[PDB]
Ligand binder design. Sequence first.
Ligand SMILES: Cc1ncc2c(c1O)COC2=O
Ligand SMILES: Cc1ncc2c(c1O)COC2=O
Ligand SMILES: Cc1ncc2c(c1O)COC2=O
Ligand SMILES: Cc1ncc2c(c1O)COC2=O
Ligand SMILES: [Zn+2]
Ligand SMILES: [Zn+2]
Ligand SMILES: [Zn+2]
Ligand SMILES: [Zn+2]
Lengths: 270, 270
Amino acid sequence: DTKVYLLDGGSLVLDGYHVFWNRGPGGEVRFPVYSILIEHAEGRFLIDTGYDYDHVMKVLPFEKPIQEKHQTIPGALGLLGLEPRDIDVVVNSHFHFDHCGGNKYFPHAKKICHRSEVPQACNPQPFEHLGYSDLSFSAEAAEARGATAQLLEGTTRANSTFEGIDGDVDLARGVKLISTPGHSIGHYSLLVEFPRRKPILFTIDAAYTQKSLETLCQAAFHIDPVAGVNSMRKVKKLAEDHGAELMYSHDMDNFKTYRTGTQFYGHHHH
Amino acid sequence: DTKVYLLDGGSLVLDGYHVFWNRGPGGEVRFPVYSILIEHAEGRFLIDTGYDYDHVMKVLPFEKPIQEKHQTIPGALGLLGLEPRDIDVVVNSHFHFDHCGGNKYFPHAKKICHRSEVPQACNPQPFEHLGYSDLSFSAEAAEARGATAQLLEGTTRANSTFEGIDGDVDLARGVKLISTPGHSIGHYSLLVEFPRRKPILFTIDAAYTQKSLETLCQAAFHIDPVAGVNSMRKVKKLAEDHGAELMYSHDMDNFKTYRTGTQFYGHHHH
Ligand SMILES: Cc1ncc2c(c1O)COC2=O
Ligand SMILES: Cc1ncc2c(c1O)COC2=O
Ligand SMILES: Cc1ncc2c(c1O)COC2=O
Ligand SMILES: Cc1ncc2c(c1O)COC2=O
Ligand SMILES: [Zn+2]
Ligand SMILES: [Zn+2]
Ligand SMILES: [Zn+2]
Ligand SMILES: [Zn+2]
């Protein structure tokens, strides 16, 4: 019928000026990170794979990760009686480290990302190195960036090739990847339709929080802030023209009301 | 990949002479009843649906049913985060009451049984009335037997029509219904193949216990005991010629070693 499970992936810390470009205010802010499991008649799709705890502790310990073992990808799938192997397709919104930390566990799945994202990861802008700091999702990108030491044993170029896409696309029936560049060169948001509840528009990094979308204030991490704003406009109109419940990527106060673990969206209405 | 879940449906009591036709020995014997959930790339298949507790307490209280609420069909599916609605196909080995008690919860699923079983249920041998005592699986059979009082509200002829089959058939890839008549006119056993463990041959009522199969001693409930014995021979050879682990329908001492609830057969071998 289509169910959506949120895999709770723990949390990270940014300054308020990171979350709210120039606006802020400043001071530490902790936000959640999660992934999106779609159980669908055409297969099990995982959208993003959270952050890898060792990677963050090594490279971004100032983000002070807190992630319990049920909040790794295999752990969170564990709560559903699932293993990484049960996932048929992994989709990455973009290759910032907190959205592709768990790709390494899916050599057998088909991978999908925007055409431009793997090239970006191999060779990012000088201000993007930190965002694209976990190359374990791609043997190729790891090579180009000289970070093959991140590759999990058994990751080859063969089991980590992506099918590049472009523009708005149907992942499956009732499931659209919505093109939302700006934050990154090939950033995608997600729209999931159900049969007895209103569509869900997952903003991912096009809108970190409700506050972001409300004031058109994007995150300070972006490659193109004009594009970033247009993508917010596009996401706002999309939500309106559909019936969509907007679910945000990194919004602690909103996250508390989100279903994680064994709870899911898309229940049968008797 | 193909997983098999056993839905534990509680237990019932027969005399030893029932379980072991003429051989026995006598005295009360309690045995388990269960159903077979196959999660498969072609859908979720439920083979049999246990016994309905109210039906047994009313009509066969001498069988002294013990069935906790997690051991009804919706309850047992409950332990998997599933509802009756998530099942795509219900297959009935035959329409004895302890194998079709839960059919009433699946109006939306496709139903499959042997060509002869619905006609048998409508109009059984005089010695079969008790076996075919729960007609809630079929609006039509309930009418013919004047037991429409068993029909759950919303059960119509439309949502309880079966596709009749005959001979050995592939339910799905790696999943065969093996024709095993004798115990009932159109009784089927089940063979499930996996990719990293030996096939499982579910005998259902063709062989109640390991002891039954070992000594060719069928249950005392049968329509044709010559056929019944041939079907045991057929099941023994099937198991040999394949690699199959034989799993029996009503074998308490063997049942204790069977995986029920959240445990399943067909794990990925890393
Ligand atoms: C580690 C951690 N950080 C944040 C949250 C949780 C965590 O386990 C659970 O719900 C949360 O918001
Ligand atoms: C959470 C987080 N930390 C650092 C970066 C990003 C993040 O989302 C994106 O680009 C970055 O440098
Ligand atoms: C009610 C009941 N009867 C038998 C068994 C169980 C029961 O809950 C569980 O495992 C069994 O063998
Ligand atoms: C368990 C049980 N009880 C009664 C009958 C059957 C049973 O399996 C089959 O035919 C019957 O009359
Ligand atoms: Zn990002
Ligand atoms: Zn992010
Ligand atoms: Zn029977
Ligand atoms: Zn039986």
